[PDB]
Design a protein around this ligand. Structure first.
Ligand SMILES: O=C1[C@H](Nc2ncnc3[nH]c4cc(F)ccc4c23)CCN1CCF
Length: 167
């Protein structure tokens, strides 16, 4: 039993809700919140900009030190950093950004990072400003993640479409 509330159950391990991931993280304080990161951990907009803003820019400060030490992530890769006031940990995961021409096949590799964590609160990878089809992202999530994932979808219209079209 966990503290996630109001989710629709899609499969044995995947759950979905129309929610602001920032507000959901602040309420649940999950062990792991997933960020929709880029390879430079520049949290300017989308989910990343919102999460970082909620940390009062502490996420960005920590991320800049991470990059200065380690260099950029790979597309499809991830790193574990602090969750600040939102979660114990933040798993920064880089899905391909279609608006940069990145290979959508890397979306499966991106979701594989979730399997290193027993339970996660997450957005749909490569959705929103990353330019991928969210219906496809949900399909890849369900077919790749085996651990327990609680998906927050900000847009109510998109949420209803994701549920109604789910196979
Ligand atoms: O709403 C969503 C889903 N992403 C989110 N899910 C949960 N919380 C979120 N907070 C955000 C804050 C932002 F500035 C930008 C995006 C999100 C977001 C996936 C695609 N989509 C439609 C429009 F992008």
């Amino acid at each position: 039993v966990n503290s996630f509330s109001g989710y629709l159950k899609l499969t044995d391990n995947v759950y979905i809700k129309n929610a602001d991931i920032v507000e959901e993280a602040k309420k649940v304080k999950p062990t792991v919140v997933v960020n929709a990161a880029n390879v430079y951990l520049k949290h300017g907009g989308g989910v990343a900009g919102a999460l970082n803003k909620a940390t009062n820019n502490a996420m960005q400060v920590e991320s800049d030190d991470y990059i200065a030490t380690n260099g950029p992530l790979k597309v499809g890769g991830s790193c574990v950093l602090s969750g600040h006031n939102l979660a114990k940990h933040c798993l920064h995961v880089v899905g391909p950004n279609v608006n940069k021409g990145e290979d959508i096949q890397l979306l499966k590799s991106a979701y594989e990072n979730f399997n290193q964590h027993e339970v996660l609160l997450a957005p749909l990878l490569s959705a929103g400003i990353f330019g991928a089809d969210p219906i496809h992202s949900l399909r890849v999530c369900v077919d790749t993640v085996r651990t327990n994932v609680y998906l927050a979808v900000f847009d109510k219209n998109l949420y209803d479409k994701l549920v109604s079209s789910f196979l």
